[PDB]
Amino acid sequence: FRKSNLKPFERDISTEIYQAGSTPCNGVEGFNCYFPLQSYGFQPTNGVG
Amino acid sequence: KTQSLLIVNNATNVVIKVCEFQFCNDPFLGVVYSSANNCTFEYVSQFKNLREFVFKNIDGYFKIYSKHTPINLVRDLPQGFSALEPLVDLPIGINITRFQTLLALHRSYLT
Ligand SMILES: *[C@@H]1O[C@H](CO)[C@@H](O[C@@H]2O[C@H](CO)[C@@H](O)[C@H](O)[C@H]2NC(C)=O)[C@H](O)[C@H]1NC(C)=O
Ligand SMILES: *[C@@H]1O[C@H](CO)[C@@H](O)[C@H](O)[C@H]1NC(C)=O
Ligand SMILES: *[C@@H]1O[C@H](CO)[C@@H](O)[C@H](O)[C@H]1NC(C)=O
């Protein structure tokens, strides 16, 4: 997740917590406040795709 | 919490770094300060004066133009014409909204 899109040829590295509503999660990963990174889970079991 | 850009100039060379520094409120260097975290780019190369610069931030590239001439005016900018030749073009890929200049002080007061 992110606030706005990316410009061409830029990169954004930031360990922040992105909240969805009015509640300001200051360093909290509680409700409506999540981690922006997510792994893939590449297994040799998975079909092409 | 985000990246930054740092171009300083000591007595011989120029060093440019795009690390993730945490900056103090009054940065300078005495007649010194730079952090180093997750540093993704580095580049080192080689009132009678006036030195002019133009900075642009276009498509993941940083553009710098430069020109210097000798002046003898009292205190203004001169009323002539001179054009600014290109200097360097750096692929930094960041977001820039503010900037701040550095000075070479004499009395170190990390305020
Ligand atoms: C580049 O950085 C600026 C400054 O952080 C971003 O501008 C912010 O954008 C959000 C969402 O639109 C606003 O809530 C903030 O108020 C803005 N800050 C300022 C100081 O104006 C800008 O979005 C960043 N560029 C990109 C492409 O994300
Ligand atoms: C400028 O600083 C660099 C380190 O940032 C250093 O290696 C270099 O020798 C300095 N240039 C001088 C002292 O002329
Ligand atoms: C900087 O690098 C270290 C080493 O992997 C990493 O733990 C840290 O999260 C990095 N900082 C970022 C990506 O902001």
Side-chain angles (χ1 to χ4, degrees):
Chain A
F1 303 105
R2 213 180 177 272
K3 271 71 63 178
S4 64
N5 290 23
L6 284 194
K7 302 294 185 263
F9 287 147
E10 90 170 8
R11 69 170 79 85
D12 179 88
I13 42 167
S14 48
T15 307
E16 288 302 312
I17 297 300
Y18 163 74
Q19 68 264 33
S22 313
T23 76
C25 291
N26 275 319
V28 193
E29 54 270 11
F31 198 43
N32 298 116
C33 309
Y34 316 101
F35 206 60
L37 274 305
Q38 170 50 264
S39 164
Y40 271 116
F42 292 136
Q43 318 264 21
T45 311
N46 285 110
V48 161
Chain B
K1 290 184 284 292
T2 53
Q3 299 217 110
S4 298
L5 173 59
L6 170 81
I7 306 155
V8 306
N9 197 309
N10 56 3
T12 296
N13 280 106
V14 185
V15 54
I16 306 177
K17 293 163 87 65
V18 193
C19 321
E20 214 168 19
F21 323 91
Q22 167 78 238
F23 286 116
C24 61
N25 284 68
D26 294 331
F28 55 92
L29 52 94
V31 77
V32 163
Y33 162 66
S34 67
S35 157
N37 311 268
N38 304 95
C39 196
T40 48
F41 177 80
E42 199 197 347
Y43 169 81
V44 189
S45 167
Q46 192 254 311
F47 304 97
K48 209 79 54 193
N49 297 118
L50 177 65
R51 296 156 77 161
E52 307 198 72
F53 291 92
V54 162
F55 314 126
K56 296 207 296 173
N57 186 47
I58 299 300
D59 283 329
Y61 282 81
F62 199 79
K63 298 177 189 294
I64 299 181
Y65 303 88
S66 66
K67 180 72 162 182
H68 79 87
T69 41
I71 74 165
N72 72 310
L73 179 60
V74 179
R75 182 68 86 197
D76 272 330
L77 298 152
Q79 289 166 11
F81 200 93
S82 293
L84 265 59
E85 318 177 9
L87 193 61
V88 79
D89 192 355
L90 314 158
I92 53 169
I94 56 174
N95 181 14
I96 296 177
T97 67
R98 293 151 49 172
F99 83 106
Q100 192 187 5
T101 177
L102 300 177
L103 276 194
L105 296 196
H106 278 225
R107 303 292 96 91
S108 300
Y109 294 110
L110 206 153
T111 309

